Design a protein around this ligand. Structure first.
Ligand code: CLA
Ligand code: CLA
Ligand code: CLA
Ligand code: CLA
Ligand code: CLA
Ligand code: CLA
Ligand code: CLA
Ligand code: CLA
Ligand code: A1L1G
Ligand code: XAT
Lengths: 85, 166, 73, 164
């Protein structure tokens, strides 16, 4: 326990007992891939092609949800990297 | 060090389990999740895939106690969700799975429930530990084979239209 | 809803000549994006507000699973 | 493990031994919040008795009716509206008169379900094992009736066929 921290990086326990054991070399590239996929899904559902009732595409929607997620994945990747993991 | 993959080292979380531990985890998923949760998921997939493979094969051969059951297990899904059978099976499956959350949560927390154990042996096919371990290994091997077989069955029966050979 | 063809609930919304409380110029849709106001009542579309509350319901039900309880997550 | 109904789960702490009908069935752990099992058992037994009476009334109204015309409706849910409000208000007042004294009784007593109702003295002379067996019979039958009366209501609301 003791999620409180004062050093350079928080302890790996703040990532939960599922991300605490992911190597940073896995989280990092996974975070970048998720960010790219989410940005592309957002730019394909909108921006590049205007949205319409007949075109919603749960893949692009679910995808776009990987952009907010990506943020968390690379934050966890940095936390793991600084904690020698 | 691994028994399944001689090149890669043995997984750290896989030492011995009567579930068929041959040390096959190249991506190290056992480090991610607790081994017990992954074992429960694997056994659930095994049982679902075995039931599904048997049902697909049988329902294409002899399944017509009525009119709406005159389908080829490929258009069966839509026809029988329109009929209402899949709704009932989903209701009972949801009840069983909602109970299974507590079963999965009672393990991973304490208790003594082995993964995939529901104390369902009404006919007592397994008697002692040796039979239990042997048939656990047999069930998991059959379930993995059934997973791959059902994957092949659906992919082939969607890549073409045919019967049992697919 | 079960088939996933959720666009069907938005097809054929209330027209611009719909008299509120009457079937003249009405539609069959129940969840739509229209924006703005009803041309007659000068108020938000009822189908707009139903869709709004459905979205809010889904979001809040999802957000209500955040904190830990007796099931380890 | 300790649940008989769900042989795999361990029952909660308050499900043990006494309070007949205890099969360890509390997966959601509702018993963990209640201070005791007295009130929940009282509510369960009241539901069991009301559901038994409801199922019996459902079947009898399906087959047997009072001589008057106002009681000639076969569908129980339609008879809920066809029957004059006088009969229903009399039934409700009778139930409330029975319910107020038991309202004083239930929230404080050790056996709130024990209303002292035994006009035929079916329990006088029975041993403890026989009494517990009778309690188990009552609870079983009541749970089955509850399921059955809810099913009857659902099938009447969904198909209009009050029976079968
Ligand atoms: C400057 C911004 C900033 C920074 C640097 C941090 C930093 C941190 N937060 Mg944090 N947080 C922030 C803003 C920030 N927070 C805000 C604005 C909120 C909302 C109020 C939160 C809510 C939050 C929670 C609830 C938790 C953290 C946690 C953490 C720690 C681990 C994070 C991690 O790897 O999760 C990686 C997470 C994932 C890979 C999952 C995906 C998460 C995405 C973003 C959710 C998307 C949905 C959402 C609605 C949008 C770390 C110290 C954790 C902690 O300290 O544990 C004790 C934790 O449990 N944060
Ligand atoms: C994962 C398990 C699973 C699932 C989801 C289904 C699902 C289905 N089965 Mg089925 N089935 C299964 C296992 C399964 N089966 C097994 C193991 C057997 C062998 C006993 C069968 C034998 C079987 C027959 C004989 C028939 C179905 C039929 C059906 C369909 C309608 C449901 C119904 O009335 O029968 C439940 C539905 C798509 C019916 C259908 O329309 O198929 C053509 C039908 O007539 N099943
Ligand atoms: C090759 C088939 C096969 C085999 C050998 C087993 C073997 C086993 N299962 Mg099992 N199971 C299977 C398929 C199989 N399963 C399928 C398809 C389902 C889905 C309905 C289940 C659902 C299931 C549950 C819910 C439970 C078991 C349990 C068990 C164990 C004790 C019961 C027993 O001896 O079953 C012997 C089975 C056979 C000899 C198959 C004969 C059927 C002919 C058709 C044992 C290791 C119990 C357990 O986990 O104990 C550890 C338990 O609670 N099984
Ligand atoms: C590989 C397994 C598999 C797959 C791919 C599907 C896929 C599907 N099922 Mg399904 N189903 C399965 C197994 C599967 N099922 C099993 C094992 C059962 C129980 C035996 C059911 C019972 C079931 C029912 C009862 C229904 C479906 C429906 C559907 C469709 C609706 C999906 C949707 O739009 O979400 C909708 C999204 C939400 C509801 C919320 C998000 C979809 C094509 C529905 C349908 O009408 O299909 C045409 C439907 O009503 N399924
Ligand atoms: C009014 C309904 C009602 C109530 C108040 C109780 C109350 C009780 N039951 Mg019980 N039971 C009921 C109905 C009910 N039961 C039915 C219908 C069955 C048959 C399946 C059972 C089978 C049963 C067993 C086998 C056992 C109990 C036990 C218990 C006791 C401990 C559990 C507890 O605290 O839960 C309190 C329960 C509630 C507060 C009810 C909450 C309402 C939930 C949310 C139900 C939601 C609806 C449901 C999912 C579906 C209903 C629709 C339809 C399909 C029927 C407690 C006195 C245990 C015992 O004896 O301990 C002493 C025990 O082992 N019950
Ligand atoms: C939950 C309990 C319950 C409730 C709320 C009702 C409610 C009703 N019953 Mg009824 N009934 C019940 C149990 C119940 N019954 C049982 C257990 C039986 C079998 C003896 C009957 C036999 C019965 C008949 C034969 C008739 C009704 C009828 C009616 C309706 C008019 C009231 C009347 O004449 O009662 C009459 C009540 C009785 C003759 C017996 C009551 C026995 C009580 C419950 C025992 C304690 C006193 C009313 C909706 C009448 C109606 O409109 O038909 C649709 C009618 O003709 N009931
Ligand atoms: C004036 C009539 C009256 C009164 C005072 C009571 C009083 C009581 N009933 Mg009761 N009941 C009645 C009529 C009445 N009942 C009728 C007609 C039925 C149908 C046969 C029931 C069926 C019933 C069951 C199945 C249960 C109770 C329970 C209770 C107790 C708690 C009720 C509660 O939470 O308050 C609620 C407060 C309100 C103001 C209720 C208003 C609800 C609206 C008016 C519904 C319409 C209490 C002793 C419970 C009990 O004793 O558990 C131990 C219990 O489980 N009652
Ligand atoms: C107690 C067990 C039981 C039994 C034997 C039946 C038996 C039957 N039900 Mg049923 N049902 C039950 C519980 C039960 N139901 C429950 C608990 C519910 C939910 C409250 C339902 C909801 C239900 C519906 C909605 C329908 C049935 C229907 C049917 C009939 C087909 C058959 C007579 C169907 C029927 O034919 O209605 C007349 C139908 O439409 N039932
Ligand atoms: C009356 C009727 C139909 C009809 C008729 C007539 C009157 C007869 C004749 C007329 O001519 C026509 C007609 C229509 O009227 C009968 C219908 C058939 C029934 C009643 C059979 C039901 C099938 C059961 C299935 C298909 C269940 C599948 C099992 C699953 C289990 C899932 C699990 O994942 C769970 C949840 C936990 C995991 O741990 C492991 C397992 C257990 C694998 C789903 O994966
Ligand atoms: C009534 C009953 C018991 C009544 C007992 C009473 C009043 C006893 C009272 C007394 O002992 C006391 C209290 C104290 C004693 O000193 C005095 C007396 C007076 C002697 C049990 C019913 C118990 C009733 C039960 C268990 C009913 C189960 C019903 C089922 C399964 C029905 C299923 C279906 O209805 C569906 C679901 C759908 C339909 O379409 C198809 C079918 C199949 C018909």
């Amino acid at each position: 326990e003791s999620t409180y921290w004062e050093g350079k990086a928080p302890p790996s326990v703040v990532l939960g007992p599922f991300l605490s054991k992911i190597p940073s070399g896995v989280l990092g590239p996974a975070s970048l891939v998720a960010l790219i996929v989410g940005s592309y899904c957002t730019h394909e559902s909108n921006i590049f092609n205007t949205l319409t009732v007949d075109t919603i595409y749960p893949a692009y929607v679910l995808g776009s949800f990987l952009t907010p997620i990506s943020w968390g994945l690379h934050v966890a990747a940095w936390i793991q990297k600084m904690n020698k993991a | 060090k691994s028994k399944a993959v001689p090149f890669l080292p043995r997984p750290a979380a896989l030492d011995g389990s009567v579930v068929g531990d041959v040390g096959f985890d190249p991506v190290g998923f056992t480090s991610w999740l607790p081994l017990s949760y992954l074992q429960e998921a694997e056994i659930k997939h095994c049982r679902i895939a075995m039931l599904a493979t048997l049902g697909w094969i049988v329902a294409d051969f002899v399944h017509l106690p009525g009119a709406v059951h005159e389908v080829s297990s490929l258009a069966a899904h839509d026809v029988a969700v329109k009929s209402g059978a899949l709704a009932q099976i989903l209701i009972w499956t949801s009840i069983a799975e909602a109970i299974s959350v507590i079963a999965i949560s009672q393990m991973l927390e304490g208790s003594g429930r082995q993964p995939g154990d529901f104390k369902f042996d009404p006919l007592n096919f397994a008697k002692d530990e040796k039979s239990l371990k042997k048939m656990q290994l047999s069930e998991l091997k059959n379930g993995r084979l059934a997973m791959l077989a059902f994957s092949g069955i659906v992919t082939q029966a969607a890549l073409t239209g045919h019967a049992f050979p697919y | 809803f079960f088939s996933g063809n959720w666009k069907a609930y938005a097809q054929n919304p209330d027209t611009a000549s719909h008299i509120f409380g009457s079937g003249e110029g009405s539609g069959t849709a129940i969840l739509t994006f229209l924006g703005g106001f009803h041309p007659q009542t000068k108020s938000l579309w009822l189908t707009d507000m139903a869709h709004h509350h459905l979205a809010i319901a889904v979001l809040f039900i999802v957000a209500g699973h955040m904190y830990r309880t007796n099931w380890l997550i | 493990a300790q649940s008989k109904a769900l042989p795999f789960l361990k029952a909660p702490a308050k499900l043990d031994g006494s309070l007949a009908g205890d099969f360890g069935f509390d997966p959601m752990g509702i018993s963990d919040q209640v201070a005791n099992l007295k009130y929940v058992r009282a509510a369960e037994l009241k539901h069991c008795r009301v559901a038994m009476l409801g199922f019996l009334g459902w079947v009898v109204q399906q087959y047997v009716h009072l001589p008057g015309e106002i009681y000639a409706e076969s569908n129980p849910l339609k008879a809920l509206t066809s029957v004059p409000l006088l009969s229903q208000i009399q039934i409700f007042l009778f139930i409330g008169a029975i319910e107020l004294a038991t309202l004083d009784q239930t929230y404080t007593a050790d056996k709130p379900w024990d209303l002292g109702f035994d006009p035929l003295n079916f329990s006088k002379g029975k041993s403890e094992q026989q009494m517990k067996d009778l309690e188990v019979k009552e609870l079983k039958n009541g749970r089955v009736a509850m399921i059955a009366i809810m099913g009857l209501i659902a099938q009447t609301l969904y198909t209009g066929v009050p029976l079968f």
